[model samples]
Target: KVFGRCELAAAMKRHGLDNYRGYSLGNWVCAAKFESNFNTQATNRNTDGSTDYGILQINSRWWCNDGRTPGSRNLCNIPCSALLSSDITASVNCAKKIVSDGNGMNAWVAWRNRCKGTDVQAWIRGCRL
Candidate 1:
């Protein structure tokens, strides 16, 4: 499902990602935008033979099981489809766990490629957060 940026930011704030793990809300918002454009059903197949799932594009290789992917570590213990839902609690929790492992937003390539070191306030431009 498609979501508005403000609505997503509100959800992120509710999840306490506004400052979770030393990452800013704008970083989360920007990562979500570049990762999946806030589409809950987004999925992308990586050239490395892994699949990225949902809004944060959590990878099947480590975080989720997509069934077709073999030897999935499934560290998040979630079905890949779970992340592809409108309710993002599972994804948010998983993301927290991921950051806790010390990589921070570097877990998402989109963040590394776009959001990192950039002024991300524009991601929440009109949001009343």
Candidate 2:
């Protein structure tokens, strides 16, 4: 499913990602915008032969199971399909677990490349919560 920026922000807030794992809500929203444009069914194949899944573009290498990727650690213990849904709770929870690994937002290449030095406040420009 697709979500507007404000709608995505609200969902992230409801999932308690407003201040999760030492990253700001702006960072999360910004990363999500670049990663998947808030499309829960978003997926991408990286050059490393791994696939990214969901709004957060979580990698199959270490996060979720896609059944096709080999040697997946599946640290999140969830199927990649689980994240590709509108509910978003699984994805948010997976993201929090990823962040807690001490990598912070560095776990997301899009976050490191695009959202890192940008003016992240624009991500939540008119959101209420």
Candidate 3:
């Protein structure tokens, strides 16, 4: 499912993504914009054969079990398919775990390129919060 920007922001904010690990709500929104354009069903195949799943493009090599990532660790203990659910609960929870890792939000290359160190306040501008 494709999400409108404000709705996505509201969902993340309600989930306590605001100021999560020192990353603001707008930071998450900005990364999601570049990661999957708010499309819950988004997936991308990596050159090494690992797959990225859901809106944040979470990696299967360590995060989820797709049964095809070749020795998957499945750290999140969730199926990659669950990440594609339009509800986004699984995705958001996994994202919180991801940020807890030492890398923080930098785990996403798109976030590094497009969202990191930018004026992310604009990402949530005009939202009712």
User: TM-score of the candidate numbered 1?
Assistant: 0.94
Ranking by lDDT: 3, 2, 1
lDDT of 2 by residue, 1-129 (tens): 998998999999999998887677889999999999989999999887889999999999999988888877899999999999989999999999998998789888889999988888898898888
- Cα displacement (angstroms), candidate 1, residue 82, comes to 0.3
lDDT by residue (tens digit), candidate 1, 29-120:
99999999999899999887889988899998889888877777889999989999899998898899888877888888789999999998
Better by TM-score, candidate 3 or 2: 3
* Global Cα RMSD, each model: 1.1, 1.0, 0.7
The 10-residue segment with the lowest total lDDT in model 1: 64-73
Candidate 3 residue-wise lDDT, 1-129, digit = tens: 998998999988888888999999899999999989999999999998999998899999999999888987888889999999988888889998999989999899999999899999999999999
Q: What is the lDDT of residue 115 in candidate 2?
A: 95
| TM-score to native of every candidate shown | 0.94, 0.95, 0.97
Poorest 10 consecutive residues of model 3 by lDDT?
67-76
Q: What is candidate 2's TM-score against the reference?
A: 0.95
**Whole-structure CA lDDT of model 1:** 0.89
Cα error, candidate 2, residue 52 (Å): 0.5
lDDT of 2 at 80: 93
| Candidate 1 deviant stretches above 4 angstroms | none
Candidate with the greatest TM-score versus the true structure:
3
